[model samples]
Every structure is written in C-alpha cells, then in structure tokens.
Target: KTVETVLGPVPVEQLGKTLIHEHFLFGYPGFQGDVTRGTFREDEALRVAVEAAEKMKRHGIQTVVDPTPNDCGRNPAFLRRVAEETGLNIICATGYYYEGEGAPPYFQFRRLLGTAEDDIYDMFMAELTEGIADTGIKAGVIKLASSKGRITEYEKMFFRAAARAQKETGAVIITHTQEGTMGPEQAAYLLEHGADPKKIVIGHMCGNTDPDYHRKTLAYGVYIAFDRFGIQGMVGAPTDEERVRTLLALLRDGYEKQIMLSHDTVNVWLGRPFTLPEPFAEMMKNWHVEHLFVNIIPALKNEGIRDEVLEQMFIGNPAALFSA
Candidate 1:
C-alpha cells in the first residue's frame, strides 16, 4: 500500500514518525475572493511553512498529512515544494470544510438552492483520483466536515456528496469536528453509505471530553484523531492535559491501534493581521507542531505510555489510514 504525497506516492511502510493532521499553509477564513481582506504574503507564508516543515524533519517526522481542503486554502504546489526542500512527505487534501460559513459561497449556494449537479462531488473525486487543480498533485484523503447543532439541510447534502465520493473512490477519509461534536454521526453516516470504517479518521476527537462519546465512535472501528493537542481556548475544547489523559484512557481500553495525533496546526497564516490575535497568540506557546514532542509526548512517555503504543500512533496508525 502507498500514501500519495505531493512529491509522489510512497510505500505506507515508509511513512515514518508522522503527524497525521496539520495545515502546512492555511489561508485566512473568508478571504477566498478577497485575499487582501485577510493577511497574505507569499514570501512570509513560504518562509514560515518551510521553517515548520524543517522542524518536523528535525523531530524525526518523515511525513505529514495536511488536511487543508481547497475551500480552506489547500495549496498543493506550495506544499510540494515544502516537502521537496525539507525532505518530508506531504499529503495534501481534497474536499470541503463544514457547510455554511465553513464553505465557499458557491458550494453553499449549490447545496442551498434547488441546484445544478452540485458537481463539487465530482471535483473532489477527480482531485483524489486524477489531480487537484492543474497541479497533478492528487489528494490522498477526502476531507469532510459538519456544523454545530443540526447538520443543516445543506450540510446534510454536503455529507451525502462527500460520502458518495469516498464510497466511489475509496480515498482515506478525515473530517473537521466543530467543538468536538457529531463524530459518531459522521462515522455512522459514512458507514451506512458504504464507507469502510477503517478508512475513516474522525479529526478533533479530543475536542470532546466524554469518554463514552469517544468510545461510541470508536465502536465503529474507525480511527479517531486526538489531533488538537495544544489549543486551550475554543469554549468546548479540552485542555492539553485533559486531552493527554483522555488519550491514556482510550489507550488503556485497548484502542491504541485506532487512535491518531496531531496539532491541526496552522503553521503559516495566509490572511490579514498576518497572525492570530490576543489570547489566541499568547496560547501559541502551546499550539505549534513541535509542542507535541516538547510537552505532550514526553508527559505521556513519563506516564508510561509504551514505546510501541507511541509507534502505533506516530507510525502505524497513519500508515493504516492511507492504506487500502
């Protein structure tokens, strides 16, 4: 089996010490048509992104999966260069974020109105099996997401399309969980539609604190990413300490093979102000990609998380995600 990277496909066994979820270059929200509306400097984004990827290499990370979908500023050409220069394999994503505010106006309207082909689904399938844009950089995963409260009529429609793409093409699946909700539903929705539970990775699994909520999702035999390791804000997100403890709880319960990790870090901002604001920036001390190795992993190691379990997380689980 192989994981398709921007540089090219690499055997899954070769994807060593990986970070399963992260954004190499994340564009600012709401700045698609108007980049000037947010902070975007090509030079700056490249510099910081290169620096971040280099750091991952130094940490012994051989690969990283960037789930920054097209609507969310997915850039395959840029990521390909980062991987080439840093010698780190980068897997770019193809799909959309949550519906409504998280998606582009066209996608929102396409799903909103009594519509055209909504051809967005076709776009995703082509990007995964063919290539993204004109870059010839095929996506390795199909990124899907949902909103808070209800799935929203449009979001439900979006999910159907996303599941259709996954069912048809069999690309690995990942998602954005708003404040840690709807994970089980995302799994059930896809599985009921014929998606392989093993190919599904419910991102932001740590965003929720209830063990039962996590366990219920895992019962589907899907991979769960406790991906947001360092963020402390976001009203519903659990603290890193809580995230680690919860990870241990899941591991102790023998779910190690089914769990994954990452910072879901926006290593380089692509829009206005050029960076996060206030407490958001202050909290950055804990949110960078290295924060996992610097803080959480060591603590988990000290707590007696076995080297093999760590291997499964940083190595094996991700390999399985990208495998057939």
Candidate 2:
C-alpha cells in the first residue's frame, strides 16, 4: 500500500521508525488576533522546523505524521518545505481540532443551516480525494477530536463525516481525546459508523493514568497513542514517569501491536513565542520531538522491553496503519 506524504506518495514499507503524532508548527485558533499578529516569519518557521526534523532524523526517525487539523494552523505547503529540507517523510492530516480550541464557528453555522454533516463530509472528501484548498498536497489521514466528558453533538457530526470518508476512501484515522476522556467513545463511535478498527487511533491515551481507561480503549481493538510524552501539568497531562509505567503495563500485557508512541511536540508554535515561568518552563524542557528516542525508549529497554517490540511500535505498527 502507498501512503501520501508531503512530497508525494510512498510505499508504506518505507515508512520506517515513524513518529505517529507531532506538528511541524501549531497555533491555537485566534492566535491571529493576538498583538503578535503578522509576526510569523516563514523563514524562521522553516529554520526551526528543519532543525526539529533533522533531530528526528538523527535519532533514526524516517517518518512523522503531523496531525495538526485544518482550523489549527495546518499548513501543508510549509510541511512540504520542511520535508524537502530534511528529506524526512511528513504526512499531514485533514480535519478540525476539538470544539474548545478549534475554529468550528463556520461548521456550527452550517449546522444551524441544516447542512453541517454534508458540508463537513464534502470538505473531508475533497481534501482526501482532491486537495486541501488550492494546494495539491493531499492529506494522508483523517483527524477527529471531542471535548472532555462527552462527544458533543457538533463533534459527533465531524465523527460521522470522517467515518463516511474513511468508508469511501479507506483513509487512516487518528483522533484527539481531551485530557484522556472520550477515547473509548471516540473509538466506538467511529467503529459504529463503519470505520475499520485497525485504521483508527485513539490519541493522547497517555494523558490518563488509569490502566483501566487504557484497557477499555484497547478493548475496541484500535491503536492507542502515548503521543504526548513530555509535557506534564499542562492540560492535566501526566509526567513521563507515569506515562512510561502505564505503557510498560500495557506492553507486559502483550498489547504491543496496538500501541504507538510520540511526543506530540510542536516544533514551532505559530504567532509568537513566549517564555513560561520557572517550574512550568522546567517541566516542559523535555517536550521536544526527540524525547521518545532520548528518554522513553531507553527506559523501556531497561524495563525489559525487547528491541523487536520497540521496532514494532516505531516501525511495524505505523506501516500497518498506513498500509492497505
């Protein structure tokens, strides 16, 4: 099977040692309205992103899936530039972020107009089969997300649209879970709508500490991503120690094929960069793209996870997800 990358289509077998989640650049919605608006420099973005991509390459990462959604500063052309500069395979996603931080007012208005689902489906299908906006860099995966506690009706509309697109085109699915909530629901909802379990990923599974929560989501037979590896105490995220323990527990249980690991890092935060206060800054020091290779994998090896299993998580699983 072939998967679309920022440069072009590539055989899935070539997607070696992949980071299943990350962003070349990210900015929350309304960052454009900030006082630092118009401060974004394409040259600077490329420089930072290239440096980050190079670091991943040096650590032996061959591919990265940037799951930044449409409303959240998902820039396909910029991604292509990074890929070109670093010669790394970059797969960009198509969808919207969660309701809270995503720009959903347009679709919400479409919902009021009674054409939200159709409109969303059209948008997703166009990007999947055609291209995003006027750019011909087609998306490689479908991204969906829901709020904490429940999947809101608006978010359900997106779930429905993405499921329909997947059914029609077989695009792989990745998703966001708010503070670890709604992971199982996200999996079940997509499955119920006819999405293949193997093609669906319930992301941010690392944010929740309860092993039961992880098991419940895994029960659906969908892949779960420990994608946010380095940021703790931000958005109720867990520490790397906690994440490693939970991951090892699942690994010990022989759920290796269904687990994906990444840092969920943003190489460049769009708009303006700011410094966080002491402990906050110190806490996020490890929130870079290389955290998985630099810290977590070594710890996993020390914990008796075989090298082959590590290969499976970083290579086999990702190739399987993108494969036909």
Candidate 3:
C-alpha cells in the first residue's frame, strides 16, 4: 500500500524512520486577528523549517507525519516547500483541532443550518481524495480531537464525519486526546463509528501515567502514541521520566506493536513571538524536534530497550499504520 505525502504517493515500505506526529508550522485560531500580528515571511519560515528538516534527515528520519489540523494553521503549501527542499516525505492531515483552542465559530454556525456533519465530511473527503483548497496537495491522514475529559457534541460530529471519510478513502485517522483523558473513549467511539482499529492512532497518551488508561486504549486494538515525549510542565502533563516508565511498562507487557513515538514539536509558531516565563523557558529546553534523537532514544537504550525495538516504533509501526 502507498501513503500520500505532500509531494505525492509513496509506498509504505519507503516510509522509514517516521515520526508519526510533528508540525512544520502552526498557529492557534484567530492568530491573524491579533493586533500585533505581523507578516509571515515565507522565505524565512522555509529557511527555519528546512534547517529543522535537515536535522531530522541527519538523524536518519526519512518521513514525518505532520498532523496539524485546518483550524490550527495547517499549511500544505508551506509543507510542500519543506518536503521539496529537504527530501523528507511529509504527510499532512485534513481536519480541525479540538473545540476549545480551535476555530469553531464557522462550523458552529453551520450547525444552525443543520449541515455540519455533511459539510465536515465533504471537506474531509475532498481533501483526502481531491485536495485541500486548490493546492491539489492531498492529505494522507484524517485528524480530529475532543475536549478534556469528554467528547463534546460538536467534536463528536467531527468524529462521525472523519470515520465516514476514513471508511471511504481508507486513509488513517489520527486524533488528539486532551490531557490524555479520553483515549479509550476516543478509540471506542471511532471503532463503533466504523473507523478501522489498525488504522487509528490515539495521540498524546503520555499526558497521563495511569496503566489502566494505557491498557484500556490499547485493548481497543488501536495504536497509542507517547508522542509528546519531551514536553512537560504544562497542565495535565507528566515528567519525561514518568512517561518513560509508563512506556517501559507497556513495552514489557507486550504492547509495543500498538505504540508509537514523536516529539510533537512545532518548527515555527505563526504569531507574536513572545518569550515564555522563567521556569517554563528553562523547563522546555529539550522540547525541540531533535529531543527524540538526542535524548529520548539514548534514554530508552539505557533502559535496555533494544535498538530494533526502538526501530520498530520509529520505522515498522508507522509503516504498518499507514498500510491499507
């Protein structure tokens, strides 16, 4: 089976050393509305993005699945330029972010017209099969999300639409689980709604440390991602130590095949460049895209995880997930 990338189709086997989740560039909704908003320099953005992608290439990363949703400044045109320059196969997603931090006013208005789900589904199908907007740059994955601790009525509509799109196009569906609260619920809902379990990935599972939470989501026969590897000190996030412990436990219990890893790093933020406060700035020192290669991988190896097993998480498992 072949997976679609920003450049075009690529065989699953060629998707080597993949980071299942990461962003080339991102902005929260209404960022353009900021009074302080400045011009986004495409030339400068591409320079920074290519530098990052080159670093990934140097670390032997061949592919990156950028799951930035439409509501979160998903830019296929920019991503295409990055891929074209760096020779990294980049898969972009088509969907929206979670309700709270995402742009929902347009869809919420559409809900009053009673065409929300159909509209969302048509958009997803058109992007996956046709192309996003008029770029003719097709999306390879379907992205969706819910609120913390619950799936909102509005978010559920996105789930239903994404499931239909997945069933129709055979594209994989990747989801965001806020605070790691709703992985199992998201998994069950997608399965019940007709998404193929093998092709589904519940993201940000590292935000919570409960074994029961991991087991519950894994039991659904869908993939779970500890994709937020180096991010910490945020609300509902655990230390990277705790994330490693939970991951080791899951691996030892024979759940490795159902797991994936990523850094969830944003190469460029598309808004006012503000500085993080004291401790936060210090804490996120390793929050860059190279955290996995420089720190996490060696840390796992020190824990006695074989290199092949790590390779499976980075290489084999991603290939399997994108395989039809």
Judge candidate 3 against the unseen true structure and give its global Cα lDDT, from 0 to 1: 0.90
Q: Model 2 clash pairs?
A: none
Candidate 2 overall lDDT versus native? 0.90
Q: What is candidate 2's lDDT per residue for 1-324, written digit by digit as tens?
A: 888888989899899989999998888998778746546788988999999988999999999999999888899989998898888999998899888878988889999989999988898899888888887988999999999988999899999999999999999999999997998899888989998998999999998989999999999999999999998878878899999999999999999999999999988887777778897888899999878888888899899999999999999999898876
Q: For residues 246-316, what per-residue lDDT tens digits would candidate 3 score against the true structure?
A: 99999999888999999999888887776889887777788878898899889988899998798889888
lDDT of each: 0.82, 0.90, 0.90
Count of clashing residue pairs in every prediction: 4, 0, 0
Off by more than 4 A, model 3? none
Name every residue pair that clashes in candidate 3: none
Cα TM-score of candidate 1: 0.93
Q: What ranges in model 1 sit over 4 Å off?
A: 37-39, 112-118, 274-280
Candidate 3 worst ten-residue window by lDDT: 32-41
Off by over 4 Å in 2: 35-38
